[PDB]
Design a protein around this ligand. Structure first.
Ligand SMILES: *[C@@](O)(CO)[C@H](C[C@@H]1CCNC1=O)NC(=O)[C@H](CC(C)C)NC(=O)c1cc2c(OC)cccc2[nH]1
Ligand SMILES: *[C@@](O)(CO)[C@H](C[C@@H]1CCNC1=O)NC(=O)[C@H](CC(C)C)NC(=O)c1cc2c(OC)cccc2[nH]1
Lengths: 299, 298
């Protein structure tokens, strides 16, 4: 049981390079539109406090160098959707897959294809933290990198990368250009809200450990759902809903461990610690596997 | 600092399924050859104690169903090399990347593209353990999934999946069909040697910690490589080879910390513990980041 990402081939066939002036970053080429972060039009001076509509109107179609591999594509139009720039090109991407743009909720996961200069560099899995950051690996020039999920050769794009907070976590937008969280595409040091742990995900991961023969954390006790949430919120865990309980059903039936039994086990682990032991190799309670993630991988 | 796979699409373009009777696994289609585990020719009952040479004499080119998607590729030749079947087909794969077959060393990492019925399913990073197993995630129908590294648009194929040991780790061959480790493609309970900590990767991790300013563990002493190997074995840590010292070179140069000085720092960590302190936030020493992986992320 490892953190598994979706195969990235369908998304690699879409990453291009977008250059405006001195600024370079990645774009996503679907059909005859190239999507990228709008701050590619900014100078270093602009980025301190940019007026984007104002800065964009002074731009021409020919200010934008879009390169797909070696081939350069000609921009025949440009418009802005929130923090995302849409560049119209005169050529449709033949590798465009069946796609959709979604906005994911906190706690859900996606694969991140990290690109630099329009070249895919690596893929890994991430979750939308409850404070709307993501704990990624992104260096300089990774803006435009997108996150996504795949459902029967339909790619749901849910994230485009824009910034690293001073704490080392990352922030970005959906493909409509709306940031996840209270962040703004300005060159300013920005803090996030207090992060919390994704509870339904930690439980899904405990189930995965049992399905794989780890049971040392289990116990005899049970807890009411409200009493578990009292302890949970004390340790900065998100509360557990009845929906979350049903989402976990399969894993409960698969293992024969009732959700509320699994909540007693997790409750003790938060009160007692792990005593130096490990679960599925981790010394920490892991919260970036969703129940579906676990289900898909174990069956 | 996280586990990060290579992009998988260059390998996706080469996954097909190979079927004999009712045994289906995955195969690897490069030019006009398809590579897959030879036990595809076995019925489940022959797998218990197969005679691959006897079994192969009775199969013919028309016993092999190779499908790219729902599309059949006609098999026009077949040979067996070690534990892999090599099926010559009548179409060169137009998505064939530039590629090589390489046999990796324990400690090295690669990406795995888990496949089922010739359809990619997921991708993740593995390290070859010193006991020649890997801690993968494979289900039924995963055999023939491959592991690979990419350097400068060149895919180096290094692993092909054959089995799950009772302990739940996995084992397989290089792309010439030679098992990593003392395992055999028989349907049988097999046991790997005791695992050990991958020292070269632990040292890579300490370099990573220094690059990011976490360097409390740097000590004032040095060591010889023979002495470090001897003590490390006493803590269940792999000895270092000359090649291990060399692939540590760029990280040694970037930090100014000589390799044998960093060994003495690790030796002190081994004999005195971490004293509740952490390194890169963690209390455990991480051993599945090669020096390449550390640089690749900096
Ligand atoms: C994109 O590459 C931008 O073209 C870049 C990616 C980050 C660079 C280092 N690692 C990355 O993930 N993004 C940025 O530089 C963004 C640009 C904004 C959205 C206009 N800015 C930041 O990530 C940023 C700014 C500041 C800051 O200011 C002052 C202070 C502290 C942190 C910080 N991060
Ligand atoms: C391939 O899918 C098979 O073509 C399959 C993959 C494993 C199934 C579960 N997870 C996997 O990684 N491989 C096998 O089933 C192989 C087939 C051999 C090479 C003929 N066998 C095993 O992995 C196997 C057999 C036995 C066993 O026997 C008895 C006892 C214990 C473990 C075990 N593993």
């Amino acid at each position: 049981f490892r953190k598994m990402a979706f195969p990235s081939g369908k998304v690699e066939g879409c990453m291009v390079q977008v250059t405006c002036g001195t600024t370079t970053l990645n774009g996503l080429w679907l059909d005859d539109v190239v999507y990228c972060p709008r701050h590619v039009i900014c100078t270093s001076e602009d980025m301190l406090n940019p007026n984007y509509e104002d800065l964009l109107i002074r731009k021409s179609n020919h200010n934008f160098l879009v390169q797909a591999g070696n081939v350069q594509l000609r921009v025949i139009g440009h418009s802005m959707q929130n923090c995302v720039l849409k560049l119209k090109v005169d050529t449709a991407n033949p590798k465009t897959p069946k796609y959709k743009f979604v906005r994911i909720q906190p706690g859900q996961t996606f694969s991140v294809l990290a690109c630099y200069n329009g070249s895919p560099s690596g893929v890994y899995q991430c979750a939308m933290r409850p404070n709307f950051t993501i704990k990624g690996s992104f260096l300089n020039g990774s803006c435009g990198s997108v996150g996504f999920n795949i459902d029967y050769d339909c790619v749901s794009f849910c994230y485009m990368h824009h910034m690293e907070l001073p704490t080392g976590v990352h922030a970005g937008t959906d493909l409509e250009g709306n940031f996840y969280g209270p962040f703004v595409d300005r060159q300013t040091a920005q803090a996030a809200g207090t992060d919390t742990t994704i509870t339904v995900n930690v439980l899904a991961w405990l189930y995965a450990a049992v399905i794989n023969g780890d049971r040392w954390f289990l116990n005899r006790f049970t807890t009411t759902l409200n009493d578990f949430n009292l302890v949970a919120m004390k340790y900065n865990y998100e509360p557990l809903t009845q929906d979350h309980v049903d989402i976990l059903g399969p894993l409960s039936a698969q293992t024969g461990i009732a959700v509320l039994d699994m909540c007693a086990s997790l409750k003790e682990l938060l009160q007692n610690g792990m005593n130096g032991r490990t679960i599925l190799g981790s010394a920490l309670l892991e919260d970036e596997f969703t129940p579906f993630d676990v289900v898909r991988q174990c069956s």
